[PDB]
Amino acid sequence: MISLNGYGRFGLQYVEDRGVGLEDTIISSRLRINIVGTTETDQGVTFGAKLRMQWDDGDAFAGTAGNAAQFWTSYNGVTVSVGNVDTAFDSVALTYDSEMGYEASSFGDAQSSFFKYNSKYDASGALDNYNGIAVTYSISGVNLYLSYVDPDQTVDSSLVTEEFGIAADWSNDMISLAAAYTTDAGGIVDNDIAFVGAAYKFNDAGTVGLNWYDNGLSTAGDQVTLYGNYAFGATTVRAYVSDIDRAGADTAYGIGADYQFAEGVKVSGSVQSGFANETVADVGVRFDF
Amino acid sequence: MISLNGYGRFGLQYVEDRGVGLEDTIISSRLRINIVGTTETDQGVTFGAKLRMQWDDGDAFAGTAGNAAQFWTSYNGVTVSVGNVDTAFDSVALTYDSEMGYEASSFGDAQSSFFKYNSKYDASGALDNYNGIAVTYSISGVNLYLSYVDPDQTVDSSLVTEEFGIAADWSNDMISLAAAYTTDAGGIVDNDIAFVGAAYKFNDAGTVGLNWYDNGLSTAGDQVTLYGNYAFGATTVRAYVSDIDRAGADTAYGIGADYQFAEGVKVSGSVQSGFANETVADVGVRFDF
Amino acid sequence: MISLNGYGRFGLQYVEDRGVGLEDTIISSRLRINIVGTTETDQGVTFGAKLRMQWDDGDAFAGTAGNAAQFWTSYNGVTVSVGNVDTAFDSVALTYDSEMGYEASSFGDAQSSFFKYNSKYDASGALDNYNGIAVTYSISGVNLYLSYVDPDQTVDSSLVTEEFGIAADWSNDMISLAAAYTTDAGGIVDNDIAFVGAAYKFNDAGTVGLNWYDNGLSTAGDQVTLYGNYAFGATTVRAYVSDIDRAGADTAYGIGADYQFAEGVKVSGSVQSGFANETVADVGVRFDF
Numbered sequence: 001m002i003s004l005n006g007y008g009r010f011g012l013q014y015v016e017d018r019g020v021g022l023e024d025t026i027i028s029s030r031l032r033i034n035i036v037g038t039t040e041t042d043q044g045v046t047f048g049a050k051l052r053m054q055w056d057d058g059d060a061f062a063g064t065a066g067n068a069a070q071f072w073t074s075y076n077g078v079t080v081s082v083g084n085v086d087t088a089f090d091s092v093a094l095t096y097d098s099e100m101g102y103e104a105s106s107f108g109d110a111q112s113s114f115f116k117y118n119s120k121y122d123a124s125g126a127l128d129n130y131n132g133i134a135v136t137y138s139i140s141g142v143n144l145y146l147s148y149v150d151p152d153q154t155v156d157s158s159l160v161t162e163e164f165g166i167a168a169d170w171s172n173d174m175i176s177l178a179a180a181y182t183t184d185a186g187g188i189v190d191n192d193i194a195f196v197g198a199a200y201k202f203n204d205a206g207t208v209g210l211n212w213y214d215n216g217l218s219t220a221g222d223q224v225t226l227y228g229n230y231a232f233g234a235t236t237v238r239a240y241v242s243d244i245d246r247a248g249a250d251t252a253y254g255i256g257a258d259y260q261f262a263e264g265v266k267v268s269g270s271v272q273s274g275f276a277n278e279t280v281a282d283v284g285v286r287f288d289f
Numbered sequence: 290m291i292s293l294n295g296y297g298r299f300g301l302q303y304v305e306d307r308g309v310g311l312e313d314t315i316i317s318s319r320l321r322i323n324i325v326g327t328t329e330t331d332q333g334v335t336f337g338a339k340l341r342m343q344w345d346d347g348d349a350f351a352g353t354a355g356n357a358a359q360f361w362t363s364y365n366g367v368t369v370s371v372g373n374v375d376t377a378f379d380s381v382a383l384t385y386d387s388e389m390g391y392e393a394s395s396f397g398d399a400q401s402s403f404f405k406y407n408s409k410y411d412a413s414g415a416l417d418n419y420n421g422i423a424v425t426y427s428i429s430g431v432n433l434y435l436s437y438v439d440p441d442q443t444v445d446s447s448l449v450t451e452e453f454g455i456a457a458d459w460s461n462d463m464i465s466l467a468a469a470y471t472t473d474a475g476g477i478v479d480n481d482i483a484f485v486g487a488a489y490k491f492n493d494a495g496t497v498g499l500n501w502y503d504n505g506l507s508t509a510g511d512q513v514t515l516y517g518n519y520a521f522g523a524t525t526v527r528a529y530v531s532d533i534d535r536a537g538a539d540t541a542y543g544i545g546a547d548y549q550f551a552e553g554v555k556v557s558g559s560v561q562s563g564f565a566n567e568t569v570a571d572v573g574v575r576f577d578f
Numbered sequence: 579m580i581s582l583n584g585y586g587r588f589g590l591q592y593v594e595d596r597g598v599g600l601e602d603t604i605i606s607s608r609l610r611i612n613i614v615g616t617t618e619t620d621q622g623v624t625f626g627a628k629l630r631m632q633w634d635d636g637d638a639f640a641g642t643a644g645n646a647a648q649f650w651t652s653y654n655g656v657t658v659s660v661g662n663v664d665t666a667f668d669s670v671a672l673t674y675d676s677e678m679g680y681e682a683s684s685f686g687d688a689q690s691s692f693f694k695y696n697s698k699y700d701a702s703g704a705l706d707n708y709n710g711i712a713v714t715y716s717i718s719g720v721n722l723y724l725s726y727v728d729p730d731q732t733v734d735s736s737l738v739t740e741e742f743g744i745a746a747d748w749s750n751d752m753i754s755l756a757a758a759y760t761t762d763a764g765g766i767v768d769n770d771i772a773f774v775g776a777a778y779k780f781n782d783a784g785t786v787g788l789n790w791y792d793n794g795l796s797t798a799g800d801q802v803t804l805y806g807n808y809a810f811g812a813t814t815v816r817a818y819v820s821d822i823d824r825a826g827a828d829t830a831y832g833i834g835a836d837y838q839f840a841e842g843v844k845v846s847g848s849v850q851s852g853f854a855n856e857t858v859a860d861v862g863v864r865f866d867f
């Protein structure tokens with residue numbers, strides 16, 4: 001069986017003083033199509049493959065192509081994946097929950113470099129022999145993630161730096177906990193990064209959370225992000241504040257809101273301020289199909 | 290929801306004396322696939338996105354890719370679109386009704402340069418930040434079209450020439466009228482073009498029409514095209530004659546026929562002669578799927 | 579109507595002493611998606627078009643694109659195809675039946691160069707104006723194939739070498755016979771190649787066969803491949819031995835097995851040795867969707 005799913009999003013993206021002779025406000029949009037082939041068996045083992053076709057405004061050649069494939073095998077709560085995999089630091093829960101606006105961005109997200117699923121082709125040729133293996137398991141309300149990424153599988157392994165990561169999250173109805181660690185993140189020797197987060201569902205309506213990072217070799221240093229959200233009917237309000245160790249950085253912050261216009265249709269906007277005082281704002285829609 | 294539709298066409302395309310050491314007759318073919326994602330809401334607002342994958346014989350690299358996306362929102366007869374939009378001069382009725390043959394061509398089509406939906410990627414990099422906005426409305430048997438195209442939305446607007454167009458068409462059972470105007474067509478300063486057309490359905494079987502253009506800065510100058518068609522059962526016969534102001538140009542003309550072999554299957558051919566005496570002929574099929 | 583089908587395969591591919599500073603064992607995988615549009619008519623003539631999107635590990639840019647299209651028309655057992663066609667030497671039965679392992683390879687396959695359906699784009703620009711025509715017919719348990727491939731249809735024909743091929747196969751329940759011949763194979767003047775094969779189904783379970791080739795201008799010279807397979811429940815065992823005329827070449831051979839894990843899911847592996855003593859091995863899965 002082959003299924004197709006995806007989403008479109010478009011709206012206004014504003015970046016204060018974007019650049020000499022550049023407009024500060026543009027129309028930023030994205031079309032994402034996922035192509036999934038699955039083979040179910042009577043033995044309970046499911047095999048699958050996926051491809052993504054993603055277009056973003058500004059893309060080179062005004063064209064869209066597929067990325068590199070991902071393959072998986074699932075059996076009894078265990079999933080093994082190969083090729084262009086989802087990585088542990090990028091898949092744990094809570095680490096991206098301060099994101100807001102129609103482009104789901106936040107200066108409070110980790111400031112480090114690490115491998116993650118590649119949505120598009122890479123013209124530099126850097127990903128041509130990139131191959132990963134990942135294993136996930138949901139044991140109880142516990143989720144475990146493991147990933148191994150080799151940036152160039154064809155070359156003798158002693159010449160390349162491979163990325164290894166682990167993560168786990170756990171949740172009941174009101175508290176959630178998550179942690180991750182990855183060594184040689186992004187294939188950079190000694191760029192070891194870690195995450196610990198927790199969130200409290202202080203209502204069916206509200207949530208407050210705190211994420212802490214060790215950003216490895218990034219110039220940002222350690223980081224802490226405190227964020228929260230509250231739902232009022234169809235509208236959700238969100239906010240966050242984040243600090244990094246880099247000398248002289250400002251405190252980043254943002255405030256935004258989502259409006260659930262209909263099932264699959266979300267209108268969002270946000271106003272944020274970064275670590276270097278950058279001012280960014282957005283407003284737009286996302287529709288799922 | 291995601292739907293796929295398209296067509297294939299193949300046949301013979303002949304160009305008298307195409308070129309030194311070139312064959313005059315080749316097999317010209319096209320495969321077009323449209324990918325449409327839509328999200329319907331109970332509020333009556335529909336959101337959609339579309340992507341096209343088009344291959345034509347002769348294309349570079351013997352490969353096919355997607356173009357740049359188009360997004361829209363429809364509500365009560367009004368449609369707003371963003372990104373790679375359909376433009377007003379390219380969408381009005383009547384302006385392409387002299388086209389004939391399996392590749393739907395005509396020297397009687399307007400000889401000017403103007404933006405229109407881009408079916409494919411552009412290797413020159415000229416379309417990378419091209420973004421348009423369009424609005425259509427069917428008020429009665431009236432159709433109104435408006436389009437705004439910015440060839441490079443990232444650059445300060447005083448440095449770029451934007452294209453603005455309007456058009457309207459109207460029809461009852463026997464007369465149709467259409468007009469369009471576009472300023473700085475194709476992003477070329479002072480290339481302002483206009484169209485006025487009318488057609489008379491002198492039967493359930495026949496139609497005669499006349500289109501007039503102002504081709505802006507093109508060397509063709511003003512143009513007039515008189516065309517007609519008549520249906521005899523499953524076969525339709527078509528003809529046209531067109532004249533442009535360019536000094537020394539010949540009168541262009543063409544005669545062709547369509548045969549409706551079955552629903553979705555059309556066999557067509559034509560013999561045409563251009564403004565510079567070029568002789569072109571074709572015969573082939575198109576099937577819709 | 580538009581349908582999508584395909585397969586994914588992944589596993590380990592081992593090549594003894596692949597190269598200085600290279601790993602001998604890598605994870606080799608492929609994702610293939612076929613896009614087929616068809617228009618059926620009440621007259622019994624079916625029209626179709628197809629596109630392929632294929633990704634293999636190692637591909638340039640870590641991306642996937644469509645290839646060049648293929649068009650066909652079928653009526654009463656006769657199929658005419660145009661564009662990126664299937665060729666006669668590549669479509670006859672028996673010629674690839676010694677292939678084994680999850681990547682279906684065999685040194686016993688013909689060692690010659692000839693045109694065949696192109697699964698992907700070609701960055702060299704060599705296929706940009708490549709166009710073929712093919713005709714197939716199943717008259718009784720007989721299959722006939724004819725193909726004509728012009729490597730550059732736009733250029734005067736006396737300047738290009740076109741490939742012409744024919745083939746036929748025939749089968750009852752226990753014997754199969756096949757033959758093919760192609761002149762100027764692969765567009766190489768005087769590279770004329772031929773195939774004759776026969777197979778004996780000495781059981782419902784076993785088969786032994788013999789293929790003979792004339793490899794035209796290849797340095798391999800004439801070749802003979804003797805192969806066999808035997809099914810034991812869900813597992814199939816296969817073997818082959820092949821010899822070529824090239825002076826000093828070794829005898830190639832291989833042994834492998836397939837395991838039908840479920841409908842659409844096949845686990846395969848093989849160990850093979852080539853004409854230059856290369857040692858290659860594989861183990862992996864293929865799933866159809």
Ligand SMILES: CCCCCCCCOCCOCCOCCOCCO
Nearest residue numbers: 058059060065121123638639641642643
């Ligand atoms: C095989 C899938 C198609 C992907 C091929 C695209 C190849 C394009 O690059 C060729 C070399 O030129 C360099 C491109 O410039 C950067 C492109 O990507 C960035 C998106 O904005």
Ligand SMILES: CCCCCCCCOCCOCCOCCOCCO
Nearest residue numbers: 012014025256257269270271281282283
């Ligand atoms: C060129 C300027 C236009 C670009 C700016 C887009 C800015 C739009 O977003 C502002 C809205 O952000 C949300 C504010 O937080 C309050 C939410 O609650 C109020 C209404 O539900």
Ligand SMILES: CCCCCCCCOCCOCCOCCOCCO
Nearest residue numbers: 010011012267283284285422435436437
């Ligand atoms: C058709 C008239 C010319 C249009 C003026 C050009 C001005 C450019 O755009 C300004 C902003 O308006 C359009 C954008 O569509 C995205 C809006 O936000 C999404 C819904 O929440």
Ligand SMILES: CCCCCCCCOCCOCCOCCOCCO
Nearest residue numbers: 060061063064065347348349354410412
């Ligand atoms: C990202 C979508 C894939 C589109 C990328 C194609 C990029 C190819 O160009 C790279 C630079 O080389 C120039 C190409 O020659 C012209 C191609 O287009 C014309 C069609 O016949």
Ligand SMILES: CCCCCCCCOCCOCCOCCOCCO
Nearest residue numbers: 301303314545546558559560570571572
């Ligand atoms: C190399 C020469 C072959 C290429 C030429 C293709 C020419 C085929 O088209 C000629 C047919 O055009 C239609 C003529 O107008 C008369 C229509 O009514 C008659 C039958 O229904």
Ligand SMILES: CCCCCCCCOCCOCCOCCOCCO
Nearest residue numbers: 299300301556572573574711724725726
């Ligand atoms: C298989 C024998 C070799 C074929 C001869 C090569 C000659 C090249 O083509 C000549 C014209 O015929 C084929 C084209 O298919 C398109 C025909 O028109 C479409 C249906 O109305």
Ligand SMILES: CCCCCCCCOCCOCCOCCOCCO
Nearest residue numbers: 349350352353354636637638643699701
């Ligand atoms: C139009 C469809 C997209 C296909 C375009 C890809 C164009 C890429 O090449 C541009 C020129 O650079 C040369 C590429 O290197 C070889 C690529 O193919 C081999 C697969 O491993």
Ligand SMILES: CCCCCCCCOCCOCCOCCOCCO
Nearest residue numbers: 590592603834835847848849859860861
């Ligand atoms: C780095 C080494 C790993 C790569 C080698 C893969 C080798 C795996 O394939 C060996 C199996 O080949 C099949 C053998 O023939 C006997 C079949 O019958 C026995 C079980 O059903």
Ligand SMILES: CCCCCCCCOCCOCCOCCOCCO
Nearest residue numbers: 133146147148588589590845861862863
């Ligand atoms: C997650 C721990 C790190 C993984 C070790 C890296 C070693 C690389 O791979 C070794 C072989 O195992 C994995 C391959 O998946 C394909 C196996 O064969 C397919 C099923 O028949």
